[PDB]
Structure 1
Amino acid sequence: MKTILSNQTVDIPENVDITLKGRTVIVKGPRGTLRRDFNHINVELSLLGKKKKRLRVDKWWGNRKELATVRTICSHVQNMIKGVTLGFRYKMRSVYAHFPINVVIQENGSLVEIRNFLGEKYIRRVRMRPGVACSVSQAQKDELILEGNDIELVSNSAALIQQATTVKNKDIRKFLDGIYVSEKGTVQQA
């Protein structure tokens, strides 16, 4: 079955403005700007409000699989709005039984050095995605903070660290050491 019309609307806050260039969305807010094109999805995007700033995604004559993309686009745009207004902050706790995992943060927070993971002498060097800043928290002991605007990049960097600290040739239900994402929140808490 081909549904005649499937549309979804997202609301844009006052402090953030959205510009459309075809299927390329530019979301500019107080924390910076974000670009993302959706040329891989055949939808129409329209800006409706001069007062309340609604963005509408319409898909005409779509089947099941391509009606599944309307809310995907809407959620991506909402994540863009969230990133440019509040930002994204992923906390990572480093857990270990015996050997403390020593994480040092190199230039501007874009490079992470894991030293003593499970007592190994190999030094893990993980480079964050551009626009992502890593730091060692002051409130908690074994905690890293990854902050950025693009949720894609922030969570990809968190996954890079988590998969860098991976146990080999051992029962992973017993050897639980590693750095794991503990919380996925925002910055500015608003």
Structure 2
Amino acid sequence: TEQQIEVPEGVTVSIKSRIVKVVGPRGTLTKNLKHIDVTFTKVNNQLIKVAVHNGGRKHVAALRTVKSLVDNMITGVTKGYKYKMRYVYAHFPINVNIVEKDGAKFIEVRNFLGDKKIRNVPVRDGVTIEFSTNVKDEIVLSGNSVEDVSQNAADLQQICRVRNKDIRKFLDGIYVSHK
């Protein structure tokens, strides 16, 4: 089938082959968007329209999602999402520095479990990670994208997953709060 997605006043959508751009005051975000047959390069003024002729189970998947991610990219570049995690610790005081001053496209977790060491991961695109107010448990991501924003949830969770000691007993772990 075919679907329609509009664009408001202070946003400019521009799909140009599979390469998409959505423009907003936070940033301008690129991903790709094109499956088998389906042509999303049909800009009818405001309405960007996905259209395909064929159907089928796995085929209808890439009809909806290319429609969805342009609505999600406008919410990302305009408003900004907030994906939610928390630093948890058992006894030892888990210490964090953020992507400002010291962190030059990296975040850090030190004193995870009983580390004298450090478990380090980089960060993705133009994500303005809002850790703390004064001090908080919660770290909360926000950026210009949708994907790259919560990718800094993935970055931070996997690098210090509770592996070498058990997750069940030892409660040093930065788990997800909710999507």
Q: Is the 8 A contact 1:15 1:29 kept in 2?
A: yes
Structure 2 distance, partners of 1:68, 1:183, is: 25
Q: Root-mean-square deviation (CA), in Å?
A: 2.1
SS at match of 1:122: coil
C-alpha contact (below 8 Å) 1:114/1:123 kept by paired residues: yes
Counterpart position of 1:54: 47
Quote the offset at 1:107 in angstroms: 4.3
**Which stretch shows the higher mean deviation, 144-153 or 103-112?**
103-112
Residues 42, 90 of structure 1: alpha-carbon distance in 2 compared, 3 angstrom cutoff = same
Contact kept, 8 Å, 1:106 with 1:112, in 2: the verdict is yes
2:114 equivalent in structure 1: 119
Displacement of 1:149 in angstroms is: 1.2
Query: Cα offset for 1:118?
Result: 0.8
Q: Tell me the residue number matched to 1:97.
A: 90
Task: Show structure 2 runs of 5+ residues with no match.
Answer: none
1:75 and 1:135, CA in 2 relative to 1: closer, same or farther beyond 3 A?
same
Contact 1:112–1:134, Cα closer than 8 Å, also in 2: no
Q: Higher strand fraction: Structure 1 or Structure 2?
A: 1
Percent of aligned pairs with the same residue? Answer: 52
Partner residue of 2:25? 30
Indicate the SS of the match to 1:162.
helix
1:168 corresponds to: 163
Q: Structure 1, residues 18-47: CA drift from partner, whole Å, max 9, x if none? A: 112123222112222122222444312222
| C-alpha distance in 2 between matches for 1:13 and 1:106 | 32
Q: What is the number of equivalent residue pairs in this alignment?
A: 176
How do 1:62-141 and structure 2 match up within 5 A?
A: 62-107=55-100, 110-138=105-133, 141=136
Distance 1:111 1:95 in 2: 20
1:11 CA drift (Å): 2.6
Match of 1:158 in 2: 153
Counterpart CA distance in 2 for 1:25 and 1:41 is: 17
Give the Cα–Cα distance (whole angstroms) in 2 for the partners of residues 34 and 41 of structure 1: 23
**Which consecutive segments of 4 or more residues in structure 1 shift more than 4 A?**
106-109
Provide TM-score, normalisation by structure 1.
Answer: 0.81
TM-score by length of 2: 0.85
Q: 1:164 offset after TM fit, Å?
A: 1.6
Note the alpha carbon deviations across 1:28-77, whole angstroms, 9 max, x for none: 122221222224443122223x4xx2221111123221111111111111
**Shift in CA distance, 151/163, structure 1 to aligned 2, threshold 3 Å:** same
Please report how far the alpha carbon of residue 151 of structure 1 lies from its aligned counterpart in structure 2 after TM superposition.
1.5
| Aligned partner of 2:6 among 7, 11, 14 | 11
